């Protein structure tokens, strides 16, 4: 019921929202003129009403407007050529997005075809490991393959995670280059009319090998125990749909003679590595095994979020109105331990604040601000 939110939001924006850390972030050291003043913010108010092209002069101005409007959620957009809140006085064609963080949005709902426990916006500990693998796979590539140093991972508050890549030269990337980065990171392709969504080449690129090796660390506990993807014929038929027909019968017989998913996976790998893809040559390998693991575990991005320079994205420390959860930074050093269900709601921290220094340090929000500050300290070091 979003009728209790206004009272809780007013307290949150008055005593708990981390304004000074937030401004340290988006002011980026104050080195570039008008960088914060030219940032678009988009507030959502009651009744799904929202406003585009809000912008503020400084931290005090942001605080006062957030505390005046108490928005249900806050989205961050690009840095523009002029003040967004003056964009109607700008000659046509001159008001232009110029810079923005490279962002990623990952939605558990995009995995429904390979999730057995949950569907739609639901999540649980048995499928959250998909996000753990997505963070590790994507973050490794952003850090090691692209050399991006300033990466803020955030729980979106309901069904997934965000990443904000904030390096100086990343923020200037064109939409076309952003799109190229997405394609580099993408392997799972196809809608609901495409049964087999992953096709690998004979020689696998090191990004693919390294991503497979990450999944291999999690696959037994995630796919074979928690999801039990080969529990019975209803489940293992979905996997047989991803391999050549000419081995279904052999695998059916092995599955029926095995006791559990662990044993049945071992048989699939043995058979798959004996399949002859090209009768021309005598070359064999684990391509099928890899294509299955990738289809079930490899990150699926909400790609349109990443391609557009102008694209809004929900802010860190925004409330998610549908759950009350605060969109909190994720401690990269404890990603395996992240529990979305310990993430505090706005109701929970407002209760803590006044249960028997009146700021977020009295509440469960404090450790999440600490992660944010570590990210901000690295940005500070990078500028001196
Ligand atoms: N009406 C809209 N106008 C502009 N941008 C929007 C709108 N709706 C969604 N978006 C963009 C910005 C959002 O931050 C982004 C992600 O949407 P979505 O994944 O559904 O929510 P979310 O990532 O904030 O939380 P969650 O996925 O956990 O529910 O898409
Ligand atoms: Mn999302
Ligand atoms: Mn989305
Ligand atoms: Zn689940």
> What would the CATH topology be?
DNA primase, PRIM domain
State which percent range the strand residues make up.
5-15%
Instruction: Specify the helix fraction band.
Output: 25-40%
Distance between the termini: 47 Å
Report the count of strand segments.
Answer: 8
Radius of gyration: 23 Å
CATH class: Alpha Beta
| CATH homologous superfamily caption | DNA primase, PRIM domain
The total number of structural domains is: 1
What would the principal axes of the Cα set say about the shape?
Answer: globular
Per CATH, the architecture is: Alpha-Beta Complex
| Major sheet summary line | 5 strands, antiparallel
Q: Work out the helix count.
A: 13
* Strand-pairing-aware structural class: alpha+beta
PDB class: replication
Keywords: DNA-dependent RNA polymerase, ATP, replication
Assembly: monomeric
Entry title: Crystal structure of the Pri1 subunit of human primase bound to dATP
Blueprint (SSEs and pairs):
Layout: H1 5-16, H2 19-26, E1 39-44, E2 50-54, H3 59-69, E3 73-80, E4 97-99, E5 102-107, H4 129-145, E6 151-155, E7 160-165, H5 175-185, H6 206-226, H7 233-240, H8 248-257, H9 261-272, H10 287-297, H11 303-307, E8 313-314, H12 346-353, H13 366-383
Antiparallel strand pairs: 1-2, 1-3, 3-4, 3-8, 5-7, 6-7
Helix pairs in contact: 1-12, 4-6, 6-10, 8-9
Zinc ion is lined by residues 115, 117-118, 123-124, 126-127.
């Amino acid at each position: 019921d979003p009728t209790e939110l206004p009272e809780l939001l007013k307290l949150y924006y008055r005593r708990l929202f981390p304004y000074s850390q937030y401004y340290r972030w988006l002011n980026y050291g104050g080195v570039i003129k008008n960088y914060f003043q030219h940032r678009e913010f988009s507030f959502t108010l009651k009744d799904d009403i929202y406003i585009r092209y809000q912008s503020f002069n400084n931290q005090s101005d942001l605080e006062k407007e957030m505390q005046k409007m108490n928005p249900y959620k806050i989205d961050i957009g690009a840095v523009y050529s002029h003040r967004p809140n003056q964009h109607n006085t700008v000659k046509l064609g001159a008001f232009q997005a110029q810079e923005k963080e490279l962002v990623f949005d990952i939605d558990m709902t995009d995995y429904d075809d390979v999730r057995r426990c949950c569907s739609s916006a639901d999540i649980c500990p048995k499928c959250w490991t998909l996000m753990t693998m997505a963070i590790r796979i994507i973050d490794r590539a952003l850090k090691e393959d692209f050399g991006f140093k300033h990466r803020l991972w955030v729980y979106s508050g309901r069904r997934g995670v965000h990443c904000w890549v904030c390096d100086e030269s990343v923020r200037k990337l064109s939409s076309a280059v952003r799109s190229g980065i997405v394609e580099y990171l993408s392997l799972v392709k196809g809608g609901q009319d495409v049964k087999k969504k992953v096709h690998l080449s004979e020689k696998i690129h090191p990004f693919i090998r390294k991503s497979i090796n990450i999944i291999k660390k999690y696959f037994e506990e995630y796919a074979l125990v928690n999801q039990d993807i080969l529990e019975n014929k209803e489940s293992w038929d979905k996997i047989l749909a991803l391999v050549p027909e000419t081995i279904h019968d052999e695998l059916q017989q092995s599955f029926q003679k095995s006791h559990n998913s662990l044993q049945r996976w071992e048989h699939l790998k043995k058979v798959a590595s004996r399949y002859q893809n090209n009768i021309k040559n005598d070359k064999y390998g684990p391509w099928l095994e890899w294509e299955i693991m990738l289809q079930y575990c490899f990150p699926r991005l909400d790609i349109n979020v990443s391609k557009g320079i102008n694209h809004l994205l929900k802010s860190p420390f925004s409330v998610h109105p549908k759950t009350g959860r605060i969109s909190v930074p994720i401690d990269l050093q404890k990603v395996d331990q992240f529990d979305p269900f310990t993430v505090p709601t706005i109701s929970f921290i407002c209760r803590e604040l006044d249960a028997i220094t009146r700021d977020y340090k009295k509440t469960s929000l404090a450790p999440y601000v600490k992660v944010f500050e570590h990210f901000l300290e690295n940005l500070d070091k990078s500028r001196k």
